[PDB]
């Protein structure tokens, strides 16, 4: 007869070694060093625009690289490309599933994507104009819902799934070029690095994995949260990233250190974090909680710098522009708002 119990211990002992390698460089926390940096003034953003059109709860959204065109996927099975500046709808795409979990905007503006409980990543060409009937490509493969997707370019797009996997697809052929495996739990979110050679993903196994797109393998595995990581976001300079989990805390992990640099949490905050985004310079970190509230944290001082939307329990999702000019929030009442 065979046995795995031993093989299960080599894994724990190795994990143990890694822990000491990390504890060996954990001399100080970030707050310690920044104990002299001046805290930011109280951040109070105000609504500049209100986008009306969706007939249901907003599930996801994503800004366009021009920091003017944005997308929003709604429980109404509709995909909408807006013009934040005027509040006008440029496109409007009917979906087959009302259960869209994510949607992305290609950095070129030519294509748009989205996927949900349909386990399929659908891509739409905005130039050939498929707003009514056409759907360029339906990326089939995953055996689990599509939690997140982000374009690397016009013919390359990565996806994360509840099937425990991440995949790099070739849009033309529609073939799952690379498969990134390792997580032991459903993959919830992923984030691309600025140079697009690396990307990070968070799963329900409570770990963050750094993958190498070109080489297709896992570089490192981060851990600290004891609950699921629901959201993850790369830092502006690409040497770190943030994560939000069901444990009601945000963690700033640095790639070189291979371990968290700081944690953002408060006793009054008891909800899980499902959304995270950095301001342009990275001084600000926006967190979205499951109670539809949003906190603005000071990346350096680990203290709430403010509240976004004034705790009205109406924020279901959000996103910051490339030019750091504004923040968008989606809601369960079907409206999107822009804030400065």
């Amino acid at each position: 007869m065979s046995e795995l119990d031993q093989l299960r211990q080599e894994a724990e002992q190795l994990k143990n070694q890694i822990r000491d390698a990390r504890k060996a460089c954990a001399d100080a926390t970030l707050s310690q060093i920044t104990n002299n940096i001046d805290p930011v003034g109280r951040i109070q953003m105000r609504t500049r625009r209100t986008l009306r059109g969706h007939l249901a709860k907003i599930y996801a959204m994503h800004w366009g690289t021009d920091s003017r065109l944005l997308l929003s996927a709604s429980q109404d099975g509709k995909l909408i490309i807006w013009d934040s500046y005027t509040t006008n709808k440029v496109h409007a795409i009917p979906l087959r599933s009302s259960w869209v979990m994510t949607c992305a905007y290609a950095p070129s503006g030519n294509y748009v994507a989205c996927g949900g409980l349909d386990n399929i990543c659908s891509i739409y060409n905005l130039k050939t104009r498929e707003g009514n009937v056409r759907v360029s490509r339906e990326l089939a493969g995953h055996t689990g819902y599509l939690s997140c997707c982000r374009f690397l370019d016009d013919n390359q797009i990565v996806t994360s799934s509840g099937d425990t996997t991440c995949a790099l697809w070739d849009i033309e052929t529609g073939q799952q070029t690379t498969t990134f495996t390792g997580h032991t739990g459903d993959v919830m979110s992923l984030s691309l690095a600025p140079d697009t050679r690396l990307f990070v993903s968070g799963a329900c196994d409570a770990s963050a994995k750094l993958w190498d797109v070109r080489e297709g393998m896992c570089r490192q595995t981060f851990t600290g949260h004891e609950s699921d990581i629901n959201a993850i976001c790369f830092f502006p300079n690409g040497n770190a990233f943030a994560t939000g989990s069901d444990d009601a805390t945000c963690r700033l992990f640095d790639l070189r250190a291979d371990q968290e640099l700081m944690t953002y949490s408060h006793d009054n905050i008891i909800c899980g974090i499902t959304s995270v985004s950095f301001s342009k310079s990275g001084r600000l970190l926006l967190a979205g909680y499951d109670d539809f509230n949003c906190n603005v944290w000071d990346a350096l001082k680990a203290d709430r710098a403010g509240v976004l939307a004034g705790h009205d329990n109406r924020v279901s999702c959000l996103g910051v522009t490339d030019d750091g000019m504004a923040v968008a929030t989606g809601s369960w009442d079907s409206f999107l708002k822009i804030w400065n």
């Binding site: 460089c25 310690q32 500046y85 393998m217 310079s281 990275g282 750091g324 504004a326």
Partner: protein, 68 residues
Amino acid sequence: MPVINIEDLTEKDKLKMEVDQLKKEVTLERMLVSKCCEEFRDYVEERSGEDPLVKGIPEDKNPFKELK
């Protein structure tokens, strides 16, 4: 070292790969947190002063100005 992979692997096949990743990760050279925080703080501080959401946007330089 392949590319495409189906998920119909056995628990063992997964444990194997797992410990291998864990070994590679062990051989990873780590930088002192102390040195990483300094660099983080540096980047942020000298840039936060230009951050539109931190300092605020002059009304004339705001793209989402009161629409007229």
